[PDB]
Design a protein around this ligand. Structure first.
Ligand SMILES: O=C(O)c1ccc2cccc(-c3cccc4ccccc34)c2n1
Ligand SMILES: O=C(O)c1ccc2cccc(-c3cccc4ccccc34)c2n1
Lengths: 343, 343
């Protein structure tokens, strides 16, 4: 598949990305120690994930650009832009793990939790963000899409940041209020916090790199991609609890963390006043006896079945969206990504 | 003076800046609560300072643009860009106060220290940064200097962030090592962390707005401005201890906080091995008996006199720099700013 092959060439490009970002140390020895710290921040935080978002840039680039315009340099730029998406992501996760007091991320200690890092990781996350624009300048300054990419990355950071504001406002630390766990609120969090950067940004970046800079073309791809983003997060919340940890590679803590999950939203929409109380008493607690009780309430309220129906309706929706909005982009741009997302 | 008059028109523009940044709530009600939080972050953090950096943009704009090109809209843009400098600053200070565990800033409780904010202020500081590019897009998208300003703000954020890395590396929390408090290191911290954004950025922004986009013109102004930035921070560190709090409006805590101050750098350059030990034992302690001892060591080593000589040499240097590098900019751009800085 388009991804599994390219993954290697993508990951191998990282070494050049790091060398290039640590190359201003040559002209300015004075900042050497700061650059050594930047190298360490990059190596720790931009590696160890699945690289799918960054890879989507590359895969979409190959599918949107005529093979004769896919020269060595065009490709170096595609991998670089892909890495920029991963750096945007690395910046949000470093910051989010500080904010929600996370202990681990992808099985390793969160960067801020590392001995001698702590709150300095706030500056480290800012550096990761700075690196996107340094890379865009280094690789894409002379390209006609340069400003388009800068604005897309900045807008995507803004939307994610607004998404994080909404999330932090919906589920504060030390605040169990299920009144604000509405469908409308959930959909907005996913849209702003995850969907734009995860789904819209990668395709949109490849689209600009391909000279597809049309407002309607971007609006049409966004329409498709934000729906893909919404399904992806709904599926993630569902798998968090009801998924098998051996397949997902994660053990669900959404209930323990008072997360505004699709599962809680659906439970709240269905639950009788007595069931609302049962949830009020057990949602957000660390105890495995209370974690088992929320799960049993969801199973009682037939949420795995509500998810199954949601999955079917979602699949018809995304196909209706692809048919109506893909053109003039090859439907394979969206289908290849949907296949990776939908099961 | 150029500043004191304009200060009012500058501060009055803030209300429009806030209205404009909270105006996307109209089209997207879904993010309303996040926008309400953004309004509160802006109001708390961008107000209460002296606005000198933002004001420098406006003052330099008036001095670099022919009065016939200073129409209502050109001016709205000057104030907006000035506010962007203040927002860049508000973003660094919110983040820096978290990082160094600050309690107060300009007599008020640090934003993160406010009840119900805490580490969420990391996202708040990111929002403040996002606001610069939203303002540049809203006011300057159709201007020929648009990309030039975006790149200057991004480069200035990067340089400040590198400056902060260097600073955090030089004086870690719970690490009293005077071996790394060298002249060369001090000069680099000031250059990257303070000088670029505080002195180079404001003039450079006005310069681009004036169509002065030449690389040599910017290199020449930078040469002047980074020296102004270096004197400003050396003077600040000196006044922190030896200044009168009734005139400076601040009580010095540099000794208590193990800061890499010009005073410690000079003490270390002069101090005998026994005096090095006296400093090693008393530098970074909260006790007023030990704070009095470091001050007495500096006074013994004749640092107020070393500062006096530095002040005189610095004044001749900045004048030599103005004479050699101002052209073709009116020397008043640099002189008006030097007068505000040098006593
Ligand atoms: O963080 C990752 O890389 C990651 C982690 C877990 C995942 C589980 C299913 C699908 C994807 C996935 C596959 C392909 C493209 C994608 C684009 C955007 C978002 C997700 C994508 C996935 N991605
Ligand atoms: O944070 C502020 O606004 C502030 C606080 C204290 C100060 C003490 C002396 C001079 C300035 C000062 C005056 C004029 C323009 C300036 C431009 C850049 C930096 C400082 C400037 C100063 N500024």
């Amino acid at each position: 598949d388009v991804y599994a092959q390219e993954k290697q060439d993508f990951v191998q490009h990282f070494s050049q990305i790091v060398r290039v970002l640590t190359e201003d140390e040559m002209g300015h020895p004075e900042i050497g120690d700061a650059i050594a710290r930047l190298k360490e921040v990059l190596e720790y935080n931009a590696i160890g994930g699945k690289y799918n978002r960054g890879l989507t840039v590359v895969v979409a680039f190959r599918e949107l650009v005529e093979p004769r315009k896919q020269d060595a340099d065009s490709l170096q730029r595609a991998w670089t832009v892909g890495w920029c998406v991963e750096l945007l992501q690395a910046f949000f996760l470093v910051a989010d793990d500080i904010m929600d007091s996370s202990l681990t991320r992808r099985g390793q200690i969160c960067w801020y939790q590392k001995p001698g890092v702590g709150l300095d990781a706030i500056n480290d996350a800012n550096l990761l963000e700075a690196c996107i624009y340094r890379l865009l300048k280094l690789y894409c300054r002379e390209q006609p899409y340069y400003l388009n990419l800068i604005e897309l990355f900045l807008q995507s950071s803004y939307q994610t940041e607004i998404g994080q504001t909404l999330d932090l406002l919906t589920a504060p630390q030390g605040n169990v209020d299920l009144v604000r766990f509405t469908e409308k609120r959930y959909k907005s969090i996913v849209k702003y916090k995850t969907a734009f950067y995860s789904f819209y940004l990668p395709i949109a970046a490849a689209m600009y790199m391909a000279g597809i800079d049309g407002e309607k073309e971007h609006a049409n791809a966004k329409k498709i991609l934000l729906e893909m983003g919404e399904f992806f997060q709904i599926q993630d919340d569902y798998l968090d609890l009801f998924g098998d940890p051996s397949v997902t590679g994660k053990i669900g803590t959404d209930i323990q963390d008072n997360k505004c999950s699709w599962l809680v939203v659906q439970c709240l929409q269905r639950a009788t006043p007595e069931q609302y109380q049962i949830l009020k008493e057990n949602y957000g607690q660390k105890e495995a006896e209370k974690v088992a009780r929320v799960k049993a309430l969801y199973e009682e309220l037939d949420l795995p079945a509500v998810f199954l129906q949601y999955e079917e309706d979602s699949y018809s929706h995304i196909m209706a969206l692809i048919e109506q909005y893909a053109a003039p982009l090859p439907p394979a741009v969206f289908l290849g990504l949907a296949r990776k997302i939908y099961k």
